[PDB]
Amino acid sequence: MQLTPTFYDNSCPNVSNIVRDTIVNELRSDPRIAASILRLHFHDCFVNGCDASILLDNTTSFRTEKDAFGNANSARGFPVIDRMKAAVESACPRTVSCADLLTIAAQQSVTLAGGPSWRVPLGRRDSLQAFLDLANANLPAPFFTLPQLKDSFRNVGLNRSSDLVALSGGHTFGKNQCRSIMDRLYNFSNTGLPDPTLNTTYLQTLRGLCPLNGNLSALVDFDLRTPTIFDNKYYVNLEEQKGLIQSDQELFSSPNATDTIPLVRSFANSTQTFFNAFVEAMDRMGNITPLTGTQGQIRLNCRVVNSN
Ligand code: HEM
Ligand SMILES: O=C(NO)c1ccccc1
Ligand SMILES: [Ca+2]
Ligand SMILES: [Ca+2]
């Protein structure tokens, strides 16, 4: 079955508003929640598709994806997802799946942060288990080279350069722990020297935030220009060699970035072009091997599989 943005227009027409209201309230006490939610949707879709598998807690039959490299002590916002789920269940019992909920929450988070607004395709169902081993293999790491980043995306069906460059735009907001960039700051590739593709001035600022013997869990903004606003500034930073993590800067400085540089330049100079590309990329990502029809189920509690 094909996903459609009208899936709940009759069954739960106010699901979108319930989701938006929840995020709006949470934003007041946690301005980072929007970025965190978008990231959860990304990490869900890359592992066995957007089936809300990442929301499942540990059981005796399978381990949670929350312990995967990249998620452990990193992913967050789970309690917030429970809140909107409870609210939706009251309005429309056993109707909206966790997979779709997280998808709508991701779109609303982008829009609320100043990004584009659009209706996401819906109709996905929830998985019966979590896939830890798959998550540990499917999630791209910050130390991947451009080719490896392209393989990682192609691995799940996103085989277009625009997919990689556009979706990476998600780093236009949110935070990153010092641990992921320590090598770029003090000893890149066992050379004992910092990453040459990192702006020397910015290098000093980052070294202040991430001391050689400091707290590896300290947080740094992904976008030094507009840390909490979803815009195209992320691409501007790349042109000045101010991409925070290795995977960011490679989109512009890698010797294999022949096909990505043009997209970076384009996105950096046109918000409309980037927003349109981001929306198309997002819908493509949200269409990765979904469960529809009778497959999977409509979870009542995103943390656990239905008992029946
Ligand atoms: C291209 C491969 C990518 C790599 C290697 C990567 C890596 C990372 C890393 C290292 C962090 C920091 C986590 C932490 O320190 O706790 C992070 C955070 C984040 N990433 Fe990515 N990422 C990638 C793609 C994406 C995509 C496609 C999106 C979604 C459109 C995304 C959205 C985010 C957001 C918004 C955050 C901040 C989350 C928060 O502050 O809670 N990332 N990413
Ligand atoms: O966010 C990640 N994957 O997209 C990630 C973060 C840290 C280490 C490994 C992977
Ligand atoms: Ca998944
Ligand atoms: Ca920004």
Q: Are residues 240 and 301 part of one domain?
A: no
Q: Is 140 helix (H, G, I), strand (E, B) or coil?
A: coil
Cα four-point dihedral sign 74, 186, 170, 278: negative
Q: Are residues 253 and 203 part of one domain?
A: yes
Which residue out of 27, 40, 42 has the highest number of ligand 1 atoms within 8 Å of its CB and is therefore the one to mutate? Answer: 42
Q: Are residues 295 and 278 part of one domain?
A: no
Helix H segments across 2-142? Answer: 15-29, 33-45, 78-91, 98-112, 132-138
For residue 134, give its domain range.
3-139+286-306
In angstroms, the CA 236 to CA 258 distance is: 17
- Whether the CB-CB separation of 287 and 70 falls below 8 Å is answered with no
Region class of 97: left (phi > 0), else alpha (psi between -120 and 50), else beta: beta
Q: Are residues 123 and 59 part of one domain?
A: yes
Experimental method: X-ray
Helix H segments across 210-270? Answer: 233-239, 246-253, 261-269
Binding residues for heme b: 171
Which ligand is closest to the CA of 46, given by its number?
A: 3
In angstroms, the CA 308 to CA 296 distance is: 13
Atom nearest to 278 CA in ligand 1: 30
Resolution to 1 decimal place, in Å: 2.2
Q: Are residues 134 and 151 part of one domain?
A: no
Domain of 201, CATH number, reads 1.10.420.10
Q: Are residues 135 and 28 part of one domain?
A: yes
Q: Is 255 helix (H, G, I), strand (E, B) or coil?
A: coil
Domain count for the chain, please give it: 2
Annotated catalytic sites, by residue?
43
- Whether the CB-CB separation of 124 and 99 falls below 8 Å is answered with yes
- Percentages of the chain per state (helix, strand, coil), in multiples of 5: 50, 5, 45
Which ligand is closest to the CA of 149, given by its number?
A: 1
Non-local (6+) Cβ contacts of 93 within 8 A are none
**Cβ-based neighbour number of residue 265 at 10 Å:** 14
Which residue out of 69, 76, 168 has the highest number of ligand 2 atoms within 8 Å of its CB and is therefore the one to mutate? Answer: 69
Q: Are residues 44 and 78 part of one domain?
A: yes
Q: Are residues 293 and 271 part of one domain?
A: no
Q: Would you state the structure tokens that stand for residue 115, as one six-digit string?
A: 């990004």
Q: Are residues 101 and 19 part of one domain?
A: yes
Domain of 10, CATH number, reads 1.10.520.10
Region class of 196: left (phi > 0), else alpha (psi between -120 and 50), else beta: alpha
For residue 306, the one-letter residue type is: N
Q: Are residues 149 and 14 part of one domain?
A: no
Q: Ligand 2 within 6 A of 75 CB?
A: no
- Whether the CB-CB separation of 238 and 268 falls below 8 Å is answered with yes
- Whether the CB-CB separation of 276 and 282 falls below 8 Å is answered with no
